[PDB]
Write a protein that binds this ligand. Structure first.
Ligand SMILES: N[C@@H](CCCC[NH3+])C(=O)O
Ligand SMILES: N[C@@H](CCCC[NH3+])C(=O)O
Ligand SMILES: N[C@@H](CCCC[NH3+])C(=O)O
Ligand SMILES: N[C@@H](CCCC[NH3+])C(=O)O
Ligand SMILES: [Ca+2]
Ligand SMILES: [Ca+2]
Ligand SMILES: [Ca+2]
Ligand SMILES: [Ca+2]
Lengths: 298, 299, 299, 298
């Protein structure tokens, strides 16, 4: 019923041992594994994929490679093609169109703090650069340093018909409800935060763009199913409760440091992160390892 | 299942025209009206009841009068008996016990910013001063200037068996979930904020300590019923949506300025607020009036 | 130039060993000591004096006793007579007038979050209740839960001629500068925070309402003197630097828990705090003790 | 007395009418004007220079051109060469060394939220990539989404001898005092905020990295002189007061939208900003224009 589904995994970007090169091979098999484990869609080279330290070429190859890894399946492949420069976002979005990806994810500009009319112009121009490519907006004030308001989000959903979803990680519940109330039900509203998935479902949300779906995709699907389809909020919450420690553990250091460490411990050789992200500490690794054991993953 | 129910109304305190005296008569009939319109419990002389500008005598008379107004019904009467002085809270809690009220509401100390172990000692001593009187804690960092943590709340629920509920208005969803996960299911977790009732239900919440239940109590009951009992989150949300503008309108100036204005417009002569709360402005009254008309309360 | 001077000490309130009674004797000798150690004025029964857990009678006795302890000297005695109830503030301010104290300190209402026009009406009414009694406003959003804006503060300084000072502890530098720019130079602007005294002097401030002046009053006087009178910011900063660890230490737990612990370590038997304030932890006491040793106050 | 002086101007980047090209000519004459009007140093292609929407090539040309515009003067030229990718910052810093600039400005990584030890590794690696290029750190939590602590800043000043200054725009006065107390007096501590210059001087600050020095450089010099040299804080404050409205006006929309509008009103054809920054509103322009008239600038 929604193009990008209920669970979208923000894919980590595997690197070889030194960090210097991407491991496209590990990227393929990891993406294929997610497509058979509850990911309805995958975001490539977004925040969790270390967008900031990838070059544009690396991103374009990752897009091509991940799209081939999941051909055969209903898994949609979304390009993390945003930027705080409209020109750069436009170029990347056009490249995503020519590669035949299923859509893009577009973050609100970070660092340069545009006015609301700037955010709006930024996204119009990007939507216009590939008018037939579905687009998911991404609002994350904690990283960007500004908030896209309800008004701006709603206006964008009306003006550009290829803008069909919003990844809302502000934690602002009123904003989320207002956007939901005023957009058409064909517009998808996704949690950008595993710990907020459940309460955002209560305000009309359609699922989650998740980090934890690398590990518990089918269980996140089951949670959403209990809540939205089967009228069992008590069971949705029983699942949320099983995985709160893991959700906390995945953010005890900045994402994707824990996500990558967890994958390495499960036998997925996704490599280190690139500077400025440093290695997981002994303390954070122990909390993560413990949370994984209690969640039944080791 | 829960002693205080699903919808608890934070009663406004009616005053006569100058503000100098309480109107106990209007208090009685307003409380009777709430008991027959979806209030499972009522809080007397809390924040919404202008606790700060009431004297202790005024509070004690309000308690007595409200308890008689709702005799015959199952509606529980809760004393807003908290303070930032433990000695004062203890005295008021003992008076509530001797008067035969159903419980107390106890705010985290405001203004004086106690440490967590201070908050904990404050509430232990109050629970111990009337060990058979059910108690609802109240966490509201925006007014008090400190936050009662998950750890503190959980520890209090384990130590004192008369502490059976928490009114959580921090808006912190992680805190709320952690408290819920770790307390026994007999422990009630209530939203302290009409706009958060629905999402807190998704994290195991048992309802709301409401301002808006003065006006739409049965509809708030219906929302909670659709969500918890009947498996209809879409309809719960349809109701939340109908009333978001009213919820916004009730806080455009500080509570209870709009609440009292709305009651006056509905024919409830609840009077002004006392200084330092001033009268609602023409601008806030227009936004409130409009929101009430669209919600089907007026004209 | 300014009625309340440059250094105003927010006096702790001594209690006897159980906390149940005030020790008026220790209050007397402590206040006499401050008057001979750079306190130009003393605030009695404010935040640092545990205002919230004192009764009104205890406060009124403290006012009487402290006023007699410093008679003969130019040390001014200020009543912490504020409240979140205008009626209570008015009553206490009238009592302060009849007792012959030198002025009052008046906090922005805490917990009940009045509108700006409410804050303004609250203070007008208090200024009008004793029109000849000098008044110092106190803005502390971290404890009260609201902020008195620059506009409101400036308007109050113009309308009421007995409002002659403001204790600004928002930490907002722009607010502070705007108030200073727009008020007459007879209006005193005081830091409400020992760590902010020096940078607020750079924006035209006239001193500080201090906790640390219990212990280093003459050194705070010297700092202000270097900056304002002698044109030596380098030396003012050398002093600020000497005492930063002590300033940090005095707030590692909520004031006045550390203040009282420091006084006990110096041989001032000021007693415990009252619930909900609990005893200082061994960890905070060690950091405090160490900071005092390095500052040359102890051992 | 310090290498970068007391007033460092964060230079706006002039664009031609469409925004598509830089106007290097206007950049030259604007920089020459600043060097004769109280700028002891100039920062090229930092935040105020629309770093986010400049390409690396545009920045490198701006560096070259600005350096030649001010040859013959004592005005130092600093490259805004930071990034949230350590690799990119390293490459830009090496280019700045080969071009013969006087130093670099290095922002704390934005958007990707590294841990403190990440921030520390980021800056070590950059300092090590050109050990003889003086370096000015830049802490601005409101844009980046994280704060570099006092401990981190102090440790960096001790480890790397080319790290000789800090542009502190957190507005945290305790952090600033602690850094000042613990670093050697050869280490420069600059306000990153025109409205904080004066109170940061009281806590041992050495001046300001300013937007308003485009317009009132000599008056900012006079303020600092009255306070630090001549023992007249009353007169320093009289000057701060004269210019508070202008300081407020310069930030009513995000920098450099007002800065560029002010320059256009003074006859400097600095052009528009690039998306996602949109034009100044009529309302913000009126407040700016009024503040400039009262300050004696038109
Ligand atoms: N690190 C820069 C450019 C990266 C573009 C390709 N991943 C940014 O986050 O804006
Ligand atoms: N102003 C006091 C009044 C004490 C009586 C409480 N009913 C307070 O807000 O706590
Ligand atoms: N506990 C109340 C009453 C204070 C009584 C007078 N000192 C308050 O802080 O306002
Ligand atoms: N727009 C990207 C790269 C710009 C590189 C040169 N200015 C960023 O802000 O990180
Ligand atoms: Ca990307
Ligand atoms: Ca009460
Ligand atoms: Ca008092
Ligand atoms: Ca740059």
């Amino acid at each position: 019923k929604h193009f990008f589904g209920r669970v979208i995994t923000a894919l980590v970007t595997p690197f070889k041992l030194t960090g210097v090169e991407v491991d496209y091979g590990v990227a393929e098999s990891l993406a294929a594994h997610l497509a058979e484990n509850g990911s309805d869609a995958i975001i490539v080279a977004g925040t969790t994929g270390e967008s900031a330290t990838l070059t544009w070429s690396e991103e374009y190859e990752l897009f091509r490679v991940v799209k081939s890894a999941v051909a055969g399946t209903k898994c949609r492949v979304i390009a993390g093609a945003g930027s705080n420069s409209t020109e750069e976002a436009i170029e990347a979005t056009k490249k995503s169109a020519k590669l035949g990806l299923d859509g893009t994810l577009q973050v609100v500009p970070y660092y340069n703090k545009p006015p609301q009319q700037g955010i709006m112009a930024h996204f119009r121009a990007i939507a216009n650069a590939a008018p037939d490519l579905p687009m998911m907006l991404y609002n994350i004030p904690g990283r960007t340093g500004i908030n896209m308001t309800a008004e701006t989000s709603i206006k964008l959903a009306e003006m550009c018909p290829n803008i069909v979803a919003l990844k809302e990680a502000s934690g602002n519940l009123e904003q989320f409800a207002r956007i939901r109330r005023a957009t058409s039900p064909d517009f998808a509203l996704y949690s950008g935060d595993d710990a907020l998935t459940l309460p955002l479902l209560s305000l009309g949300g359609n699922g989650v763009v998740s980090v934890a779906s690398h590990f518990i995709g089918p269980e996140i699907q089951r949670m959403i199913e209990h809540f939205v389809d089967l009228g069992n909020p008590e069971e949705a919450f029983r699942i949320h409760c099983r995985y709160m420690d893991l959700f906390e553990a995945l953010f005890v250091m900045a994402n994707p440091i824990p996500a990558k460490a967890a994958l390495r411990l499960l036998g997925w050789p996704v490599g280190p992160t690139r500077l400025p992200l440093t290695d997981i500490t002994a303390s954070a690794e122990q909390q993560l390892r413990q949370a994984m054991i209690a969640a039944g993953l080791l």
